[PDB]
Each structure stands twice: as structure tokens, then as C-alpha cells.
Design a protein around this ligand. Structure first.
Ligand code: ISS
Length: 265
């Protein structure tokens, strides 16, 4: 039984687990703590890129953005390497999604602009997609650090699944912008041990991970069966019982995803 299996994993990892898979033609919604709030952590970077894509002509991707030492304040595997030359918006989108680049994300927030260094406009983008639940209040590094229970910088597996569904499978973005987003998630480098690990190799998996303090580990994905039937999978977790320095546990998500893949196969 699926809920039994998820509860078993929670006990195994001393964790809180949230899971949502939207209903399709022949499958019921899968939901476990799906309406509980979990920190976004880096999962926000996927809808962030969508916000920036949406807001601008496609060739805004070619705009060069410069930044300096005091802009590197978080894990930034790509931006740290290009600080001396700058990065285009396209390069920032790429790094934000594929390397979960924190500086790239901050610069993209600033590009989106408005109050809160773009956090207000980011939240507004989500509201435009009918998400009245999620909220972004801080950028990197602060957004991963809110205490367990605090609503700042949170989404829910349910809310984020419906947002991702519109972005990737629905018509939130024009086809060209949709393809850019989809392809970046498809080429993600951070996700091998999460949802990807739970689905057989003949299923296509695209994703954006999140990791944070208090043992936070998330992953949002779109997967396609070997016959091209897509499902959206959101998995979020925290281990508040270990305190701020609790280790995120990817294996939770891999196991949760295996359970899910078992039902969808
Ligand atoms: C996106 O999730 C970036 C997360 N940066 C923080 C960490 O990965 C370690 C703990 O927060």
C-alpha cells in the first residue's frame, strides 16, 4: 500500500515526506502530505527561468550580465567560473537549472526585477498560473534556511506539481520557450540520485532538484513512459528532527520515486 510505504520511508529516514503526482486519463492523483508546506529550496529555479523566458523576447537570452565578487554568496558551480567575463541570460538560465547555480538564480531574480529583488515578481508569476499557495520571500543563500514550519519560501508538492505541469505539458509558455525550459531540465546534472533513480531507464526523466538546511531534499520532475505518456512527480522532504545541520538524504527521494514508478508502470 502506497501510503504505508511512504510512512515506512519517513520512519527509516527520520523525515517528513511529501509526494504529489497529478491525476491523468487513467491514473488517480498520488498524494502524501501533498498539501503540507515544504521549502522550495532550488526547485524555484525552474519556474524562475520560465518567468524570465515568459517576460522577454527570446533573444533576451543573448544579453550579457556582469557581476562581481560580492555577488557570489551561495553554491554557484558555473557563475564562480565566469565572474571575470559575465554570463548571458541564457547561460544564467542554463546554470540555474542544470547546476542549481545560486548566483545565477539571484541574477535572474534581479532581471525579473521589482520589490524584494524580484521575489515579489516571481511569486506573481506563480499566481498567474493559479498557484495561490507558494511564496518566495528571500533569494540565495537565505531561502534554504527558514525554520521547519515557517511559511516563508515554501511551496507544497501539490502546488509545485500543478505549476510544473502547466510549464512543461500545458500552455503556460509558447512552444519555443517551453522547449528551452524542458531541454534545460532534461540536461539537468544534479538529479541522478533522485527521481531519476526511481524510474526505469526507458522512461524519460527531466527534473530540478532542491537541497536545504534541516535535511531538506526535493525533486520536481516530468517523466514519460516508454510509450510517451507523461506524469508530473513532485517529491519533497525534510529531516527537522536532526536540526539545522541534518543531512539531506537523496535515497529517500529515490525510494519514494521507485514506489511511484511501481504504481505508474
Ligand atoms: C538549491 O536547492 C540550492 C541549495 N543550496 C544549499 C544546499 O544545497 C546545501 C544546504 O542548504
Amino acid at each position: 500500500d502506497l501510503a504505508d510505504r511512504f510512512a515506512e520511508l519517513e520512519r527509516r529516514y527520520d523525515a517528513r515526506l511529501g509526494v504529489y503526482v497529478p491525476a491523468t486519463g487513467t491514473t488517480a492523483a498520488i498524494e502524501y502530505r501533498a498539501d503540507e508546506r515544504f521549502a522550495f529550496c532550488s526547485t524555484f529555479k525552474a519556474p524562475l527561468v520560465a518567468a524570465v523566458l515568459h517576460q522577454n523576447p527570446l533573444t533576451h537570452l543573448d544579453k550579457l550580465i556582469t557581476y562581481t565578487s560580492d555577488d557570489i554568496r551561495s553554491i554557484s558551480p558555473v557563475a564562480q567560473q565566469h565572474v571575470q567575463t559575465g554570463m548571458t541570460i541564457g547561460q544564467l538560465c542554463d546554470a540555474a537549472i542544470r547546476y542549481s547555480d545560486g548566483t545565477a538564480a539571484n541574477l535572474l531574480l534581479a532581471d525579473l526585477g521589482g520589490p524584494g529583488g524580484g521575489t515579489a515578481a516571481f511569486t506573481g508569476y506563480l499566481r498567474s498560473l493559479g498557484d495561490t499557495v507558494s511564496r518566495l520571500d528571500a533569494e540565495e543563500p537565505e531561502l534554504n534556511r527558514d525554520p521547519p514550519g515557517d511559511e516563508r519560501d515554501t511551496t507544497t508538492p501539490h502546488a509545485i506539481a500543478l505549476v510544473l505541469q502547466q510549464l512543461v505539458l500545458g500552455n503556460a509558455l509558447p512552444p519555443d520557450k517551453r522547449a528551452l525550459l524542458t531541454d534545460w531540465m532534461a540536461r539537468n546534472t544534479t538529479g541522478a540520485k533522485r527521481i531519476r533513480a526511481g524510474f526505469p531507464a526507458d522512461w524519460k526523466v527531466i527534473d530540478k532538484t532542491g537541497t536545504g538546511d534541516y535535511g531538506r531534499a526535493n525533486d520536481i520532475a516530468v517523466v514519460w513512459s516508454p510509450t510517451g505518456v507523461p506524469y508530473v512527480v513532485a517529491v519533497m522532504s525534510d529531516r527537522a528532527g536532526g536540526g539545522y545541520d541534518a543531512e539531506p538524504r537523496e535515497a529517500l527521494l529515490a525510494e519514494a520515486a521507485t514506489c511511484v514508478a511501481g504504481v505508474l508502470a
